[PDB]
């Protein structure tokens, strides 16, 4: 089983630079290696093969070079759109084995999120169960700290926080938490807020509403 | 205009089985060798096996961790490829892509659990009433197995400023997912927002219009 280690596992880098990813083959391959870009939420395109051919459509700022065990894949000009995960297959003998992947993360200027608190509907509370939603949008970087409060009590073991990829265009993060609570203990409290710490804030900011106004 | 579209993913108990298949098209696909690769959660691309033409007698190699289990085929004259699937185990769990070598399908989820189907319930996530203008709105998707769910606003003519959080897993057991999109504060009261829920796995398909709460 021919062993394929990328270098490195992950990499930030500013747009227009030149970014270069190694891939380290276990035995000789010979040519027989390919590149590929995985885009978040998006299937395997094929960039690179016989370690150096340019796959047809693929931008001529991507190029591979190598032959034996060591094989380089290079942008020369990192665009946001490249924000992706990138892979070397070694297609010599059976079984065809993947690298790990390289994620490639692009370094920009601090991005300060646009906070917006979102009351439970009506229509859920009905069920039994009340979702209070606290969306940080376009921020830059990913490091954000949100807090729920409920009447003065922090929250705590009863939210969830999703992270979208970095935007293909401006290169900022999303984040939403989910604070659940029983309709209950939703309906004995008024204050509903979360606070957002985040480096392009001078200081944390709150969103809050009081239940039913 | 080459196209690769897998079929037959879904949910199915641990030791059963379940047959995808890859209707090619937009190149000769005798001459061609078709590959599975599989993408769990978070994880590497893993080589499945690969299917070789005609003239190489159809010839099959598989990866370690599903050699005597998968079996791949092709039908040259439905322009089709096979990965049928047997002993499955929750491991097993991921996408599963269809490769002519050159190009990869959109890719299909196999789920292997003892899990329940469920559909989810759609709710809003109602702009507020606020002048700065930016405004924020969604609708939540709240409590399915098993993924994916997929959301489109207002039918896919509304895109820009669209963000689809990953799905969380919750303490449950169940999914929840957010999709939200900023617009201008202004045509709050005149653009009708409809997000497009569809969970194919319970059959759901909702229209959720979010609007400004009275």
């Known amino acids: 089983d021919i062993q394929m280690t990328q270098s490195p596992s992950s990499l930030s880098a500013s747009v227009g630079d030149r970014v270069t990813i190694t891939c380290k083959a276990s035995q000789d391959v010979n040519t027989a290696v390919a590149w590929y870009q995985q885009k978040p939420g998006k299937a395997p395109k094929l960039l690179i093969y016989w370690a150096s051919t340019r796959h047809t459509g693929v931008p001529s700022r991507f190029s591979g070079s190598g032959s034996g065990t060591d094989f380089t894949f290079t942008i020369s000009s990192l665009q946001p759109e490249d924000i992706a995960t990138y892979y070397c297959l070694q297609y010599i003998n059976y079984p065809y084995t993947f690298g790990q992947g390289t994620k490639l993360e692009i370094k920009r200027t601090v991005a300060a999120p646009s906070v917006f608190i979102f009351p439970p509907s009506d229509e859920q509370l009905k069920s039994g169960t009340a979702s209070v939603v606290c969306l940080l949008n376009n921020f830059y970087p990913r490091e954000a700290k949100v807090q729920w409060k409920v009447d003065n009590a922090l929250q705590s073991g009863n939210s969830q926080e999703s992270v979208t990829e970095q935007d293909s265009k401006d290169s900022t993060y999303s984040l939403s938490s989910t604070l659940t609570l029983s309709k209950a203990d939703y309906e004995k409290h008024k204050v509903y807020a979360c606070e957002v710490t985040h480096q392009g804030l001078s200081s944390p900011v709150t969103k809050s509403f009081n239940r039913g106004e | 205009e080459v196209q690769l579209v897998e079929s037959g993913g879904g949910l199915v108990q641990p030791g059963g089985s379940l047959k995808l298949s890859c209707a090619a098209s937009?190149?000769?696909?005798?001459?061609?060798?078709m590959n599975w690769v599989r993408q769990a959660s978070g994880k590497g691309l893993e080589w499945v096996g690969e299917i070789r033409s005609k003239s190489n007698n159809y010839a099959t190699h598989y990866a370690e961790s599903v050699k005597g289990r998968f079996t791949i085929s092709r039908d040259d004259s439905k322009n089709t490829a096979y990965l049928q699937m047997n002993s499955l185990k929750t491991e097993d769990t991921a996408v599963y892509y269809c490769s002519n070598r050159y190009y990869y399908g959109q890719g299909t989820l196999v789920t292997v659990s003892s899990a329940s189907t469920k559909g989810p319930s759609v709710f809003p996530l109602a702009p507020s009433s606020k002048s700065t203008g930016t405004a924020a709105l969604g609708c939540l998707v709240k409590d399915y197995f098993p993924e994916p769910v997929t959301v489109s606003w207002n039918s896919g003519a509304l895109t820009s400023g669209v963000h689809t959080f990953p799905a969380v897993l919750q303490s449950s057991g169940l999914y929840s997912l957010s999709s939200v999109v900023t617009v201008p504060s202004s045509s709050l009261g005149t653009q009708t927002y409809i997000c497009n829920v569809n969970h194919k796995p319970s059959n759901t398909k909702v229209d959720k219009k979010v609007e400004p709460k009275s």
């Open positions: 937009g190149f000769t696909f005798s001459n061609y060798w």
